[PDB]
Amino acid sequence: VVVLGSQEGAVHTALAGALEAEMDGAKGRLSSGHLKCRLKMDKLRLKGVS
């Protein structure tokens, strides 16, 4: 009976190209975004008109 050793680097190469969220600080800080947004220019006005 033998163990399969470690498996850290075996799975390091298993997620090649997968999205990464390395940063920490008790909050996972992602490194990818594709957020769609709508901009409402109703109640904004130029500062230098008067």
Partner: antibody, heavy 124, light 117 residues
Framework: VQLQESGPGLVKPSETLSLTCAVS?????????WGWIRQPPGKGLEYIGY????????YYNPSLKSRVTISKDTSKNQFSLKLSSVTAADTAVYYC?????????????????WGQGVLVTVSS | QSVLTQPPSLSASPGASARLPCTLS?????????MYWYQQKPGSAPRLFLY?????????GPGVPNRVSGSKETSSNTAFLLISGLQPEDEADYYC??????????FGSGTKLTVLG
């Protein structure tokens, strides 16, 4: 990132000296080498060493090689300095400062944010 | 070796241009060294004043104005801390700093700049 220094008022010679530094506004272990710099009575600034934020590696001074030991603990977001076998000439004003090691902007390779600073003498 | 040196005292009348040099050791080439300047008011925790490497690679303190300039004379390797509009509040102790091959902080002696009156 406003660092505050806290430490005992006085230590006798040849006795362990410990300063505690709370960063209070930035999470350690993200990077940003944290160090300790001193100015004994009124002379120039002398540095002692810094510890890596993320990895935790410690880089010290060649003259203060066997006496100091810098510690780190991100649970309460603090890092400390231990000065063993102090001498009478070690009376100084200490400052725990920040520094960047890998960034692409060389301005932050210097000590950007400084601490308040503590004064410690080695008299009887 | 690798120690910086500069005079203990300098002074100039308010209004003139004060040049604070910083002579590096012989084993350094100032033309490729990121110079770091610290300003220390007498008892208030010296702050980062001006980092200079080139006239196009420079960055000042968070609130210091453009009166503070930097330059390098590569003939005798010596950085400069130029203060053009000398006000009475420019009276402080100024330091310079570089790094060795192993990236150990190398500070300078620094000049206690005094604004006259």
């Amino acid at each position: 990132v406003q660092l505050q220094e806290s430490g005992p008022g006085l230590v006798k010679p040849s006795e362990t000296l410990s300063l505690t530094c709370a960063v209070s506004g930035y999470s350690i272990s993200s990077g940003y080498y944290w160090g300790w710099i001193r100015q004994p009575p009124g002379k120039g600034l002398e540095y002692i060493g810094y510890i890596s934020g993320s990895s935790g590696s410690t880089y010290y001074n060649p003259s203060l090689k066997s006496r100091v030991t810098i510690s780190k603990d991100t649970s309460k977001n603090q890092f400390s300095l231990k000065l063993s076998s102090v001498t009478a000439a070690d009376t100084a004003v200490y400052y725990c400062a920040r520094r960047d090691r890998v960034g692409s902007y060389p301005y932050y390779y210097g000590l950007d944010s400084w601490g308040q600073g503590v004064l410690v003498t080695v008299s009887s | 070796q690798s120690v910086l040196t500069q005079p203990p005292s300098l002074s100039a009348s308010p209004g003139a241009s004060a040049r604070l040099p910083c002579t590096l050791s012989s084993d350094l080439s100032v033309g490729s060294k990121n110079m770091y300047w610290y300003q220390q008011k007498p008892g208030s925790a010296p702050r980062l004043f001006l980092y200079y490497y080139s006239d196009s690679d420079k960055q000042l303190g968070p609130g210091v104005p453009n009166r503070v300039s930097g330059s390098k004379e590569t003939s005798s390797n010596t950085a400069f801390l130029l203060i053009s509009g000398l006000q009475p509040e420019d009276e402080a102790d100024y330091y310079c700093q570089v790094y060795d091959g192993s990236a150990n902080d190398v500070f300078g002696s620094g000049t206690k700049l005094t604004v006259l009156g």
